[PDB]
């Protein structure tokens, strides 16, 4: 509309340009990154998880909310489509490599599903700096250590709560209490992807539809390997791990990684050796590399 | 000039905390009894006697051959794993120090041996392993603590650690003189504790004879920060023989950064890692 909008880019768009949008606007959308069949396969895998009856024991997040809370943690362990296809998408990683150039290696801190039902209110505007509170004190100019990647799995509309993003707001000193009309809407089709810079002020739009159609989203956080993964994928069976590509294994914390100089050795190692060597980890695309 | 303060092992933790914010460092006298120091040294002797490896060594291959180093001592030295790592005074200090940031764990603990004729290190801050630390404001909650265990005598001759008191308040390292620093001269069993941002240097070893100076360095970091050393390949039997505190230090349990993190970190299936693993411990039901 009137205000400058989120730019929607083709999957083959220029990475330098995407990197610049992140620094100027703080966010952008990749159009039709995931084909519809991938999206639907992912959705069915998620349906299976959500249909599982509630467990007997403790659930750290879920126990904090009423029983109608819809959440699937660490989707990489239970959704093969995410693990084998979405997680290792080459466009996503081209962006990450450029974005994290100053900080070095990155990996997956978390990827999880939320569903926002009809009649739910919008989120307060905020920054994604709560999981690793030290991020709250990092200056704007410092090398970024986190990137938010948002996957709509149903339509995002003005009505059902499309993500509200305030362009340029990563340059603000604080969040404050911004008006809703300061934000623009990440309206999207399933298969699109929203990419959001560290420190950008934003809010989930809730869902004001009344027809019972929930809005589904998978949120993935790619962080500097300096930062401890929220979700640990260390209990994945070896057969599952070795079925992944090297990149996948790197994302899920199964390999030694490298923060930027002046760390000149790396991180996540043991016996002064690479973790994957100590584990004698095979990978699906080891013959080609 | 002001020297490093030497405190009895049973001194009041509030005083220790005060010293870290004012001086940036202090020494605990006789924290580890002689038998602990001796068994630990014997265990390290075993590792040091093990022949040089064939394959790549990530850290060691970057330095000259006189580099003497034993990585992740917790996996090979029961005395560190069962006694030193879980010392209650160290953790009283950590709990006070990390109050603002939340839970902490072990990023690394390793041995270095410094031979005769080695020069002192350049003055520096310990902000290289996790470079994001370089950009954290002075006022922000600390996310790292250096704990230094002399395993041989630290003398003015053999390279006692050089610490510049109050330098954590400096904007940058600059080009400090050696006489700006004071020496952490210590006996085995003592412990040197050094705050984030404190400018310091290993003292090398100016002796011309005798056995090298032996030191174990442990870095305790906010659980927000990825451990340099990962202890995830430890055998289950070894892990379960440890106390809950030990398991928490070595990354085998779910941990909790301060609010506004209200769930925790290092979890899976929306459960605690130790519950998913059905982890036993020496001191849990
Ligand atoms: Co002078
Ligand atoms: Fe958010
Ligand atoms: Fe140092």
């Amino acid at each position: 509309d009137s205000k400058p909008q989120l730019q929607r880019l083709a999957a083959d768009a220029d990475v330098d340009r995407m990197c610049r949008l992140l620094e100027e606007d703080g966010a952008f959308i990749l159009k039709g990154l995931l084909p519809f069949d991938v999206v639907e396969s992912f959705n069915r895998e998620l349906d299976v998880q959500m249909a599982i009856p509630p467990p007997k024991g403790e659930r750290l997040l879920a126990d904090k909310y009423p029983p109608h809370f819809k959440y699937v943690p660490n989707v990489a362990t239970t959704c093969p489509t995410f693990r084998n296809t979405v997680l290792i998408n080459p466009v996503i990683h081209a962006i990450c490599e450029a974005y994290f150039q100053r900080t070095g290696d990155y990996w997956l801190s978390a990827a999880f599903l939320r569903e926002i039902e009809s009649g739910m209110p919008a989120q307060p505007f905020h920054r994604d700096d709560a999981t690793h509170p030290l991020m709250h004190y990092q200056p704007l100019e410092a090398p970024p250590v986190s990137l938010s990647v948002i996957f709509p799995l149903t339509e995002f509309t003005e009505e059902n709560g499309a993500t509200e993003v305030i362009l340029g707001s990563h340059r603000w000193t604080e969040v404050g209490t911004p008006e809703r009309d300061q934000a623009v809407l990440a309206t999207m089709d399933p298969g699109d992807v929203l990419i959001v810079r560290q420190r950008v002020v934003h809010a989930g739009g809730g869902n004001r539809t009344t027809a019972g159609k929930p809005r589904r989203v998978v949120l993935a956080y790619f962080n500097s390997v300096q930062l401890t993964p929220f979700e640990t994928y260390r209990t994945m069976p070896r057969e599952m791990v070795e079925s992944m590509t090297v990149l996948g294994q790197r994302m899920l914390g199964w390999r030694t990684m490298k923060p930027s100089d002046p760390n000149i050795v790396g991180i996540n190692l043991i016996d002064d050796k690479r973790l994957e060597n100590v584990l004698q980890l095979k990978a699906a695309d080891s013959p080609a590399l």
Side-chain angles (χ1 to χ4, degrees), chain A residues 5 7 20-27 166-170 200:
Chain A
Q5 299 292 308
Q7 296 198 26
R20 279 170 199 146
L21 280 175
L22 284 180
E23 289 308 300
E24 176 62 32
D25 281 358
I166 306 183
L167 305 189
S169 58
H170 54 295
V200 172

Side-chain angles (χ1 to χ4, degrees), chain A residues 119-268:
Chain A
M120 288 290 91
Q123 234 176 354
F125 283 108
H126 63 278
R127 291 172 158 160
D128 287 345
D129 58 3
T131 306
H132 299 81
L134 68 79
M135 288 177 53
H136 192 68
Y137 309 91
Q138 290 265 113
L140 174 59
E141 296 74 21
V145 293
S146 185
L147 182 68
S148 304
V149 179
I150 295 150
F151 301 94
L153 293 185
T154 60
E155 197 176 13
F156 278 22
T157 69
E158 307 193 357
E159 190 182 23
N160 73 2
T163 311
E164 308 169 3
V165 186
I166 306 183
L167 305 189
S169 58
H170 54 295
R171 286 184 293 268
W172 298 355
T173 51
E174 49 177 327
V175 173
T177 49
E179 291 194 35
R180 297 284 161 179
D181 61 25
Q182 287 177 247
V184 293
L185 303 179
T187 51
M188 291 179 289
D189 296 311
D192 295 343
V193 181
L194 170 63
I195 310 293
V196 182
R197 195 205 184 278
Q198 187 173 328
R199 280 177 67 94
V200 172
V201 181
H202 61 285
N207 187 348
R208 309 164 195 88
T209 61
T210 61
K213 303 179 269 75
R215 178 170 58 80
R216 185 179 274 192
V217 60
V218 165
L219 300 103
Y221 293 106
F222 291 91
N223 289 353
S224 165
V225 300
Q226 300 178 68
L227 297 181
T228 303
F230 176 68
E231 292 169 347
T232 175
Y233 299 98
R234 69 196 275 172
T235 66
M236 285 179 54
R238 186 179 187 96
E239 198 191 10
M240 183 179 287
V241 175
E242 294 191 330
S243 74
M244 301 189 304
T245 63
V246 170
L247 182 56
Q249 297 178 353
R250 292 180 67 254
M251 289 305 104
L252 304 189
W254 281 87
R255 297 190 166 232
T256 292
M257 307 288 273
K258 174 66 167 64
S260 168
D261 294 351
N263 181 321
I264 49 95
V265 177
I267 205 164
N268 200 37

